[PDB]
Ligand binder design. Structure first.
Ligand SMILES: *[C@@H]1O[C@H](CO)[C@@H](O[C@@H]2O[C@H](CO)[C@@H](O)[C@H](O)[C@H]2NC(C)=O)[C@H](O)[C@H]1NC(C)=O
Ligand SMILES: *[C@@H]1O[C@H](CO)[C@@H](O[C@@H]2O[C@H](CO)[C@@H](O)[C@H](O)[C@H]2NC(C)=O)[C@H](O)[C@H]1NC(C)=O
Ligand SMILES: *[C@@H]1O[C@H](CO)[C@@H](O[C@@H]2O[C@H](CO)[C@@H](O)[C@H](O)[C@H]2NC(C)=O)[C@H](O)[C@H]1NC(C)=O
Ligand SMILES: *[C@@H]1O[C@H](CO)[C@@H](O)[C@H](O)[C@H]1NC(C)=O
Ligand SMILES: *[C@@H]1O[C@H](CO)[C@@H](O)[C@H](O)[C@H]1NC(C)=O
Ligand SMILES: *[C@@H]1O[C@H](CO)[C@@H](O)[C@H](O)[C@H]1NC(C)=O
Ligand SMILES: *[C@@H]1O[C@H](CO)[C@@H](O)[C@H](O)[C@H]1NC(C)=O
Ligand SMILES: *[C@@H]1O[C@H](CO)[C@@H](O)[C@H](O)[C@H]1NC(C)=O
Ligand SMILES: *[C@@H]1O[C@H](CO)[C@@H](O)[C@H](O)[C@H]1NC(C)=O
Ligand SMILES: *[C@@H]1O[C@H](CO)[C@@H](O)[C@H](O)[C@H]1NC(C)=O
Ligand SMILES: *[C@@H]1O[C@H](CO)[C@@H](O)[C@H](O)[C@H]1NC(C)=O
Ligand SMILES: *[C@@H]1O[C@H](CO)[C@@H](O)[C@H](O)[C@H]1NC(C)=O
Ligand SMILES: *[C@@H]1O[C@H](CO)[C@@H](O)[C@H](O)[C@H]1NC(C)=O
Ligand SMILES: *[C@@H]1O[C@H](CO)[C@@H](O)[C@H](O)[C@H]1NC(C)=O
Ligand SMILES: *[C@@H]1O[C@H](CO)[C@@H](O)[C@H](O)[C@H]1NC(C)=O
Ligand SMILES: *[C@@H]1O[C@H](CO)[C@@H](O)[C@H](O)[C@H]1NC(C)=O
Ligand SMILES: *[C@@H]1O[C@H](CO)[C@@H](O)[C@H](O)[C@H]1NC(C)=O
Lengths: 215, 151, 205, 155, 151, 151, 155
């Protein structure tokens, strides 16, 4: 049995959000529910809990008490997590899971769900800028800077060379914009032979910039 | 076999049946008397433990008064209790699983009516007692039939 | 509860047995302890529920034991798809869900020599806004690496199945007017395979 | 709909049934009646050196307290796979009570203790002797509240 | 353990269930037929005296008919009856309380309907059978069940 | 005495209660799982010949894992099963009557809902099994119950 | 509205409980553990003719398989009554197991047979000897699938 749901995304600071976990394929009322998040780099964190078909006993994490409310609707069989007054530490991936808590059964979350990305940002999406990194065996790179947390695709020579290419995942910044660098290493023979062009395609604003890096 | 003893009732009871524990068989508590309806469920199920304690209390109460050694219980050990509860709890303990130590119980009371559930004993594990949350659903599942008890 | 894993990261190859340890502070009920597996994309799995038990769809290479404040999770044999994050979990106390910090199991190999490169800015980057220089290391092992920058004397990918050897980048950033102060800048990196430090520098121009 | 707890006191079921309680891992207190008492202990030292002891004259003397010997009777009868060969270090001269054994077979007797006051393999405790003794009305029953179901389980 | 025997049924019975006593089984009476509704409560009770007697009667019929010493009941006694009722009655007798003796019974007959009740047994106390008014409320307590039988 | 064990349940079940049976202890079948409603009836009847086998399966399942001889079942036999069923079938076979060997069972499936009922068992006599017609009424009797399950 | 049938396989309960099956009224099979196997054979001939055996040292010599002696012990105990003369005999030299009963009284042993591999009277069989022996795995369970109730009911 599996749980299907959707939600999350980009929200500006100070807004309000709703997480929905829908249920299908099991007797809903006879089970307890948990909401758990995973921040980038660290271990999982509690977010909320709720007990079985009473809506009576409610528990929240020690850190995040107050800004969250958790509820369950048996008529539509939905977990509703209402978030108010968003902070800058809520950027993470959420899981909605289910477990039962009795004498015979030990405690375990078995039917998990789908991870849900949630991110807070002040500015909107702004197209990045592409920088060149031309130098036995050497290496050359394409860098993109002033980049939005949404994913992009960066490619060498329209994907002709797919060997020895390393793309670095975005890392925490200071200003508030991600960035990423890609490097490809080739022996001395290949230098000056094949045309190498840095291609960046970014779905928000659909920025499709192709710069032919040449001397 | 099967337990055969019966509840002896009291004099000042508000209902024809139903036991009422006194002050001397409780710790840091007063005398409490359960409803007759709750006690009516003891003689119809073999998977309960509190009614065994009531049967032992009643047997002792009649033994002290109506008679002036210990073969009275050797001859009547079966008529009062069920040895398989002891065996089952022993097997749960030997498998490193929560079991019941026959000492303290949890019940569910109603603020106004006073109708009460049949207590089930609190569970232990290796000298350490549980928290309320660890069996939350139990606490609420009985609550459900409370609504069903209204029908 | 304070609940920690040990060791922080494990390095082993298939063939032998390995152990992970979970330690707490308060007294622990063995019946409410779970062990969880977290891979890259797929949702986390239920490796073990109970102090020493079995799941519905888990191989027989896993086992658990322990008591008191010690928990041992033992894997007798490995697999190409058994290297990800692990967690030990307790129900109750404070807060109700006491997830662990983290664990990671990797592969063992001999030492390798990193390939080093340094990339300074260009003349067009006056339109960039702020100057950046990239000190890049590729194909090094093990994880122990230290990077520093010197005047007048972070980003990482994941371990790859085809190679199992890491990469590292440093993006030093300086404001436009602040760059015209000095002319020589160095980046230095040290790692246990090369006891002698190797430092590389560049001259403005 | 509110939750409450209650705790029974087994002290009232005093003379109808034997009661038992625990101090620590190697101590057990048995009480019948009001004043009589038995100590069940594990100890590394031997006391009785009399290798001859028969149980016929024990019940034949009839000067003993006949409401007490039944408990130790059920105790040595309930142990399983008992050889009835030797090492029976019993002694009741002068009307007193004393029973002890070597633990170095012990699996059955240790299971007996675990049942009489409360994996599964042939556990080998480091203690070497089991001591049965008379005792006075002390305050043994303090580590845990005494309960009568320890004796019910054995029966 | 628990009693496990069943009912052999009859040929001319109106309803598939039910047991009809013979004339040669009673004293100064005729054959009597109990409805299936009344006898359906034997397999869901443990504190009755009539149903044990019917089990013994069934066993006697089958043993005399389908076979041709005494070890049979020496082996089947636990199956047919429940020794705990014997212990309970013996304890009530040793402590001087009115008690049952498996000799004579009482029931309620509805003349028009023909539906009857499970006969709870009479009580004796030291050579004197009880008199009717003494357990008056019981005689009417089961009467209330007939009202609930209208549903 | 009375059986006292409880069903362990499983992770990944449609409902909280209900015992799902795997494919390693069946013949010519895969894993097969029963509804919780059918499971709810084992803990209230003593003549059922099926739930004893579920109890034995669960005891073995929980003894293989959380352990590392045979005296365990010597101590647990009473708490697991009811020897009176064995004696009942033995006395019924020795009188040359069809009896249940606890080998194969029949249940009333429902095509859409899947609310399978609690199976009784096929009987046997002198090595020959029976036919569907010989207990026709039985096959129909339980059917009536499922109609009352609609209420 | 549809009838179905399921047949349960009693082979998984291997070590938790002994099992038994039937080929023919001559010999009955007992399996314990992973492989340990006992035959209960009816035959007119005698394979051993020793005149003296006893059980005390059988458990006292203590080098035997202690998970196996139990079934023959419960077989020896479950028979209703027994003749004073020890017509039955035993032999365990070399580690093997051999228990012979001289049938040529039989009522109890025949009901034990009717129960172990499962009108009421003292009709006896034409066979004159019971041999109780060790065996290999081989195959004794083909006519009827093995079941555990052959031993549960006689405990
Ligand atoms: C032995 O049992 C008796 C019977 O319960 C105990 O006497 C009772 O003690 C309580 C506690 O104060 C009183 O409320 C009762 O009135 C007493 N009942 C009597 C005197 O008949 C007695 O305390 C027990 N003694 C020991 C040493 O356990
Ligand atoms: C449990 O506590 C008792 C009493 O506190 C201990 O009994 C001791 O026994 C030794 C002889 O074996 C005496 O010399 C001591 O005076 C006793 N009292 C003590 C040590 O306080 C008993 O040893 C304790 N159990 C264990 C396992 O240590
Ligand atoms: C002895 O019992 C074991 C335990 O059930 C049997 O092994 C099982 O066999 C089935 C059928 O092949 C497998 O699905 C299980 O995985 C096995 N379990 C284990 C723990 O190995 C074994 O077959 C039995 N012995 C014989 C001779 O049948
Ligand atoms: C339940 O509550 C009522 C009112 O507070 C009280 O009178 C009664 O004693 C309680 N029940 C018990 C068992 O004490
Ligand atoms: C019980 O708790 C104690 C701590 O007091 C611990 O040492 C022990 O390992 C636990 N388990 C058992 C079986 O004693
Ligand atoms: C129970 O809850 C308390 C919180 O008051 C906590 O300290 C303890 O660790 C929990 N678990 C127990 C007592 O097993
Ligand atoms: C215990 O009781 C017996 C029986 O009278 C007596 O002989 C013995 O001296 C007593 N022991 C103690 C320590 O009082
Ligand atoms: C234990 O055996 C030794 C002989 O090895 C003997 O001296 C001693 O008295 C025995 N102790 C008990 C308590 O039986
Ligand atoms: C008893 O002796 C054993 C074995 O020498 C030892 O392990 C144990 O600690 C001793 N117990 C004591 C001295 O209380
Ligand atoms: C009940 O009464 C009817 C008619 O009054 C009679 O036919 C029937 O036999 C009576 N019941 C019994 C058990 O005798
Ligand atoms: C019933 O009544 C008679 C006289 O009316 C009386 O002698 C008898 O004692 C009464 N029954 C009982 C049990 O007392
Ligand atoms: C009952 O039948 C349905 C189909 O008619 C099937 O899906 C289901 O598995 C059956 N129930 C069992 C317990 O096999
Ligand atoms: C039973 O079959 C075995 C097969 O090995 C055979 O030796 C024996 O004689 C047979 N006995 C009877 C009575 O058929
Ligand atoms: C039992 O039989 C053996 C075998 O000859 C013999 O040595 C022994 O004395 C007999 N008696 C006992 C008590 O072992
Ligand atoms: C049965 O097992 C015993 C154990 O040693 C062995 O001596 C004997 O030869 C075995 N019987 C066989 C293999 O027929
Ligand atoms: C077995 O019993 C028969 C009785 O007919 C007897 O002739 C034979 O000698 C006995 N076998 C022995 C004692 O070994
Ligand atoms: C054993 O002897 C009886 C009569 O003496 C005979 O009927 C039977 O067939 C014999 N059994 C064998 C296996 O020869």
């Amino acid at each position: 049995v599996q749980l299907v749901q959707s939600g999350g995304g980009l929200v500006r600071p100070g807004g309000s959000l709703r997480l929905s976990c829908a249920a299908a394929g099991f007797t809903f009322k006879s089970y307890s529910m948990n909401w758990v998040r995973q921040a980038p780099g660290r271990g999982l964190e509690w977010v909320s809990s709720i007990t079985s078909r009473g809506g009576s006993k409610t528990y929240y994490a020690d850190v995040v008490k107050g800004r969250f409310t958790v509820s369950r609707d048996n008529a539509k069989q939905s977990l509703y997590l209402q978030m108010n007054s968003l902070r800058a530490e809520d950027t993470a991936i959420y899981f909605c899971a289910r477990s039962r808590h009795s004498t015979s059964q030990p405690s375990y979350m078995d039917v998990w769900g789908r991870k849900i990305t949630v991110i807070v940002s002040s500015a909107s999406t702004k197209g990045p800028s592409v920088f060149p990194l031309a130098p036995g065996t050497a290496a050359l790179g394409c860098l993109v800077k002033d980049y939005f947390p949404e994913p992009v695709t960066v490619s060498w020579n329209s994907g002709a060379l797919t060997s020895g290419v390393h793309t670095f995942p975005a890392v925490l910044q200071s200003s508030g914009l991600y960035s990423l660098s890609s490097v490809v290493t080739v022996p001395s023979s290949s230098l000056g032979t094949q045309t190498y062009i840095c291609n960046v395609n970014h779905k928000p604003s659909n920025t499709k910039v192709d710069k032919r890096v040449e001397p | 076999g099967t337990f055969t003893w019966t509840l002896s009732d009291s004099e000042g009871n508000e209902t024809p049946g139903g036991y009422c524990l006194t002050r001397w068989m409780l710790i840091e508590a007063e005398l409490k008397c359960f409803g007759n309806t709750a006690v009516a469920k003891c003689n119809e199920k073999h998977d309960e433990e509190f009614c065994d304690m009531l049967r032992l209390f009643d047997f002792n109460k009649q033994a002290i008064r109506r008679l002036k050694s210990i073969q009275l219980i050797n001859k009547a050990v079966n008529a009062l209790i069920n040895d398989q509860l002891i065996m089952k709890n022993h097997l749960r303990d030997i498998m490193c699983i929560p079991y019941c130590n026959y000492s303290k119980y949890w019940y569910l009371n109603h603020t106004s009516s006073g109708r009460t559930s049949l207590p089930k004993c609190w569970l232990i594990s290796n000298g350490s007692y549980l928290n309320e949350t660890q069996f939350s659903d139990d606490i609420e599942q009985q609550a459900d039939n409370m609504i069903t008890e209204m029908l | 509860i304070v609940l920690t894993q040990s060791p922080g990261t494990l390095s082993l190859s298939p063939g032998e047995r390995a152990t992970l340890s979970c330690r707490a502070s308060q007294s622990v009920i063995s019946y409410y302890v779970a062990w969880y597996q977290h891979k890259g994309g797929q949702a986390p799995r239920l490796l073990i529920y109970g102090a020493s038990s079995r799941a519905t769809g888990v191989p027989d290479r896993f086992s658990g034991s322990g008591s008191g404040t010690d928990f041992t999770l033992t894997i007798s044999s490995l697999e190409p798809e058994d290297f990800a994050l692990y967690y030990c979990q307790y129900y109750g106390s404070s807060p109700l869900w006491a997830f662990g910090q983290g664990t990671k199991v990797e592969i063992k190999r001999t030492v390798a020599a990193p390939s080093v490169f340094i990339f300074p800015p260009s003349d067009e980057q006056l339109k960039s806004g702020t100057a950046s220089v990239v000190c890049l290391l590729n194909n090094f092992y093990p994880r122990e690496a230290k990077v520093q920058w010197k005047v007048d004397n972070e980003s990482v990918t994941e371990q790859d199945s085809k190679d199992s050897t890491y990469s590292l980048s440093s993006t030093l950033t300086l404001s436009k007017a602040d760059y015209e102060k000095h002319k020589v800048y160095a980046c230095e990196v040290t790692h246990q395979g090369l006891s002698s430090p190797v430092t590389k520098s560049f001259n403005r121009g | 709909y509110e939750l409450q707890t209650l705790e029974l006191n087994m002290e009232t079921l005093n003379m109808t049934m034997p009661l038992s309680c625990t101090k620590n891992s190697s101590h057990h207190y048995i009480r019948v009646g009001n004043e009589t008492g038995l100590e069940l202990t594990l100890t590394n030292t031997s006391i009785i050196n009399h290798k001859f002891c028969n149980l016929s004259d024990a019940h034949k003397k009839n000067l003993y307290d006949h409401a007490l010997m039944s408990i130790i009777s059920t105790f040595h009868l309930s142990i399983p796979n008992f050889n009835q060969y030797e090492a029976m270090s019993c002694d009741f001269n002068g009307g007193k009570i004393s029973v002890q054994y070597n633990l170095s077979v012990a699996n059955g007797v240790l299971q007996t203790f675990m049942r009489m006051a409360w994996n599964w393999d042939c556990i080998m405790t480091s203690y070497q002797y089991l001591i049965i003794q008379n005792t006075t009305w002390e305050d043994h029953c303090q580590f845990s509240r005494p309960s009568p179901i320890g004796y019910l389980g054995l029966l």
